[PDB]
Structures are given as C-alpha cells and as structure tokens.
C-alpha cells in the first residue's frame, strides 16, 4: 500500500501560486526518510513535528499543496511570515502542523525570453486567511475612482507573470513547492 508521492513531486506541470492545487492523501504508508536524505530538495522544513522523527508519526489525513514561486519567496512558505506570497497567495497558519518541501525547477519552468504560465497575485485589499485560495481576476482599484473593468491609472490587473528565464539569478529562478499538512 504505497502513496501518490511519485505523481505529486515528479509531476509534469505545477500550478501557479495564486491558483495553488491541493491533493488529498488519506492512509497510505510513506517513507519521508528518502526525502530528507535527498540533496535534490533545496528546502525540507517541518513545523510542530520534527523532520527526523517523521516516519513513526500517524495522522488521520495528509494534504499535499503544490505551486511554483521563485527562490527568494520560499522563505515566505512558513508560519508567521509576510510578503507577496504569504499575504496575497498562500498563507500558512501559526499553528501549522506539517512540512514544506521545495526544489529548484529552473530546467523545467524557465524559458529563454521568459515563461508566461506561472503567475502571482500582485494586489489585494486584504490579506488571505490561512489556506485561502483566491483566483479572482477583478481589476484592482487602488484609488477612490472606480475602475469599470478597464485598466489605467490606479486601476491595475491583480496578477503578474514571473517571466522565468534560465539566465535569471538563482534567487529569481522557479522553485516547485510542496506543502504537506497533517490533521
């Protein structure tokens, strides 16, 4: 009785951070020891549960949230963080019990001239609640004058493209992130 970890980490295409995808995993034995021992994963950090002592633990359900950001933003996928991703795209609660795994995906998600497939929310009037998912494309009204669906001064599109390039700095290269939560 194994798990779909194979098709979640080694998936062909990931989702944008603003439209983060969630896979549900309930009752299947897994070996998180081959992942902690892997140099492929640039980030393996767990909260509320030790990353070493992980295989013994048992919880009723496991959620696998996956998305793509850039390297400088991987520090925001943690409880009590602030920034573009944490405030407007993906917020982890303070009492989050799980792990955050990330690896550099430059060879897959970067294109010469810039990739147009991965977006991130740039404007929002209020911060996201923990595990909230916002995919609305409403024109952000930054001023008092109401936008009527048309962009302009103080009327901007809420989503922006990363424009991933292979020549970008490693801080700006694409990173695929997988967030495991245990309830």
């Amino acid at each position: 009785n194994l798990c779909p970890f194979g098709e979640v980490f080694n998936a062909t295409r990931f989702a944008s951070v603003y439209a983060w995808n969630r896979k549900r995993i309930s009752n299947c034995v897994a070996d998180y020891s081959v992942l902690y021992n892997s140099a492929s994963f640039s980030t393996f950090k767990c909260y509320g549960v030790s990353p070493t002592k992980l295989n013994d633990l048992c919880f009723t359900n496991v959620y696998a949230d996956s998305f793509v950001i850039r390297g400088d933003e991987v520090r925001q996928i943690a409880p009590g963080q602030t920034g573009k991703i944490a405030d407007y795209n993906y917020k982890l609660p303070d009492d989050f019990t799980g792990c955050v795994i990330a690896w550099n995906s430059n060879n897959l998600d970067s294109k010469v001239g810039g990739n147009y497939n991965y977006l991130y929310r740039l404007f929002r009037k209020s911060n996201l609640k923990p595990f909230e998912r916002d995919i609305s494309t409403e024109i952000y009204q930054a001023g008092s004058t109401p936008c009527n669906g048309v962009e302009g001064f103080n009327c901007y599109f809420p989503l922006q493209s990363y424009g991933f390039q292979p020549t970008n700095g490693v801080g700006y290269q694409p990173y695929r992130v997988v967030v495991l939560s245990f309830e």
């Epitope: 897959l108 010469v112 001239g113 810039g114 962009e151 424009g163």
Partner: antibody, heavy 127, light 108 residues
Framework: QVQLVESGGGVVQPGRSLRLSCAAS????????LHWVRQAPGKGPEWVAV????????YYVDSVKGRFTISRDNSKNTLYLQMNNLRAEDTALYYC????????????????????WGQGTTVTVSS | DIQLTQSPSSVSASVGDRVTITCRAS??????LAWYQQKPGKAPKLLIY???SLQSGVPSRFSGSGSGTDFTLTISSLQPEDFATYYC?????????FGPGTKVEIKR
C-alpha cells in the same frame, strides 16, 4: 504594412565574407527582437541567430558561432548579419524574421517564434 | 539541443478531410511550441504559437494541442489552400530547432 525586406546576398568564394541587411517597416522596430533563419535547397528551415531589442543579447547556432555576427541599427530600422569565413554548407536562402511577443498580464515575453518573415535573400558559397 | 520529430512524413488527403500532424520532442518543452505552414517558393507562415494560440488571420479550422513532449496540429476540414508542408518549432532554449516537416499531399 508590416514588412521585412532583406538584401545583400550573392555568390562568394569559400572563406570570404558577405553582409546581409534587413529593412523593416510597419511596426515599432525597437520593441521586437529579430531572428535570422536560413533554408538550404530541399531542406527545412534552420534558425541561425537572434538579437534582442536593444542589441544587448545575441545568440547563434553552433554551426555559425564565431563566424557570423548579428547586429541592428534601431535608428535606421535595419537588421544585419555579418557572415565571415563562409563554407559550402552556408548556401541557403536567408530570411529575417520578427520575434513573437506573448503578452500575459500586460507583460511581454520574448523568443516565442517568428510571425513576420521576409522574402529571403540567396547566398551561394562556391569556388 | 532539443530535437523534434514529426509523424507522419507525408499525408495524402482530400478536401474536407480531418488531418492531424504530431510533433515529438526529445525533452519536455511545456507550452513553447509553434506551427508553421510553407508553400513552395514562399517564406514560412506562422499559424499557431504557444501550442494552441491561433495566429491572427489563420482560419479557426486550424487547432493545436499538446504539453511536454507530444503535440498535435489538427485541420478539421481541409481546404485547397492548405496543401503544403507543416513544421513544428520549439522555443524552450536556443538554438530554435524545427521539425522535419510533414507534406500535405493531394490524394488522387
């Protein structure tokens, strides 16, 4: 009308040089990177070189690396390909083409293909 | 250096037929593939870019699909001005490589 017209081809001995030009009109020249594509008789197209909008980035196929030099004059709306130390396998019809700029969330993304092609200019490397 | 293979090498179709051409890449190239149409003595003509984005002016009978290594160009109802050689081009990294092309021939 959006139009690319290349010129400067002809017959040349091996090892000698040739300079191709590309005259553009109908679009803002400096907002588009530009490609050079060649096509040998009976064969399919082969991408040769590209230059960015301002001329800061240049990329070449390994077959022409070190022998060809792409350049552009934004004030004259003209693209150039400087071909040195020519070989027989350089014989082909040479087109200049405009980069396909994909716009997503009002951001430009470059190097996505070629949408506007010229009529081609013929070079023939023979003794 | 990303290679591209097309299948079949030739197709013998008639007016109204549904023609499908495939393009296989040696590595995953996401949604960065374009399709070109070329007639003898003419420069290539861009039909589709980004797998499934119809270039302006191209009739809607042309369509495209695919992701990663396998891509498809479909002509729903073939019209007389569609008999030509079709190429697939990837745009993940330089050099921009083309496919070997598939010639659409008149069946008789």
């Amino acid at each position: 009308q959006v139009q690319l017209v290349e010129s400067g081809g002809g017959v040349v001995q091996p090892g000698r040089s040739l300079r191709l030009s590309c005259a553009a009109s109908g679009f803002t020249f400096n907002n588009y990177p530009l490609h050079w594509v060649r096509q040998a008789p009976g064969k399919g197209p082969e991408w040769v070189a590209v230059i960015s909008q301002d001329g800061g980035n240049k990329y070449y196929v390994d077959s022409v690396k070190g022998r060809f030099t792409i350049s552009r004059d934004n004030s004259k709306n003209t693209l150039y390909l400087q071909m040195n130390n020519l070989r027989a396998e350089d014989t082909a019809l040479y087109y200049c083409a405009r980069d396909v700029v994909v716009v997503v969330a009002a951001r430009n993304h470059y190097y996505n293909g070629m949408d506007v092609w010229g009529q081609g200019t013929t070079v023939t490397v023979s003794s | 250096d990303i290679q591209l293979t097309q299948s079949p090498s030739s197709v013998s179709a008639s007016v109204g037929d549904r023609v499908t051409i495939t393009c296989r890449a040696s590595q995953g190239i996401s949604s960065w593939l374009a399709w070109y149409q070329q007639k003898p003595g003419k420069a290539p003509k861009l039909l589709i870019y980004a797998v499934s984005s119809l270039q302006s002016g191209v009739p809607s009978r042309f369509s495209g699909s695919g992701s990663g290594t396998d891509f498809t160009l479909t002509i729903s109802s073939l019209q007389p001005e569609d008999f030509a050689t079709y190429y697939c081009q990837q745009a993940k990294s330089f050099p921009f490589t083309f496919g070997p092309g598939t010639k659409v021939e008149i069946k008789r």
